[PDB]
Design a binder for this molecule. Sequence first.
Ligand SMILES: CC(=O)SCCNC(=O)CCNC(=O)[C@H](O)C(C)(C)COP(=O)(O)OP(=O)(O)OC[C@H]1O[C@@H](n2cnc3c(N)ncnc32)[C@H](O)[C@@H]1OP(=O)(O)O
Length: 196
Amino acid sequence: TKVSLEGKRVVLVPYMAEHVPKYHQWMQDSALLEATGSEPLSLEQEYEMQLSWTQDPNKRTFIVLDKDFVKGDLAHGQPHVEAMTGDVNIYMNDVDDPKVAEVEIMIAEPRSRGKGLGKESVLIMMAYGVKNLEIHKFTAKIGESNTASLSLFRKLGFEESSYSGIFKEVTLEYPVTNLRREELLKLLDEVIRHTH
Ligand SMILES: CC(=O)SCCNC(=O)CCNC(=O)[C@H](O)C(C)(C)COP(=O)(O)OP(=O)(O)OC[C@H]1O[C@@H](n2cnc3c(N)ncnc32)[C@H](O)[C@@H]1OP(=O)(O)O
């Protein structure tokens, strides 16, 4: 990824080595680890994953910045550690269909929760996938007790498609209908790109 994406309240920037120390600190929250799909890493592994995640052709990943905390402009590829808030990604992980993508979202900083940053970050990333990856269905895998994430995805219009009692995990789907495709592309048309 060579660009960052500026919406109304968030900037989605490429995950950089400069972001790793704060990201690693977020991941010390066992609740965050369990709520996301994450295993605890060493710092070494966290740095190596920054390189591998961002080189993976089947993934798109961004660090979420809260625009209220950004100091300086978005035009020079700077990491803006001071505004780091979370992450968002899509993974094309369906062997049967390269136009299906799984979504993940995390807003790790309490000071930035409840401002609509998770919703906007997911919508921008979904729209990016529709335009550039031709995604026609998104999925989300959510722990059965994760009230906050279940609410977010359902309020976006994701619908439950299956449940694993073994893993205590709900899977939701978002078919990209003609109307949703139009809406998402219009939204992305208003997102400012910066070279990064
Ligand atoms: C598919 C996956 O990624 S599963 C893993 C999801 N990530 C996590 O669980 C990490 C821990 N939690 C988080 O990161 C955050 O709580 C998130 C991402 C779930 C929500 O981030 P926020 O930025 O606070 O959400 P945002 O402010 O954009 O609100 C969006 C919707 O989320 C829902 N929501 C957010 N927080 C809560 C909550 N505490 N309880 C219930 N619903 C909630 C609401 O429906 C809200 O819509 P409303 O504002 O109209 O009520």
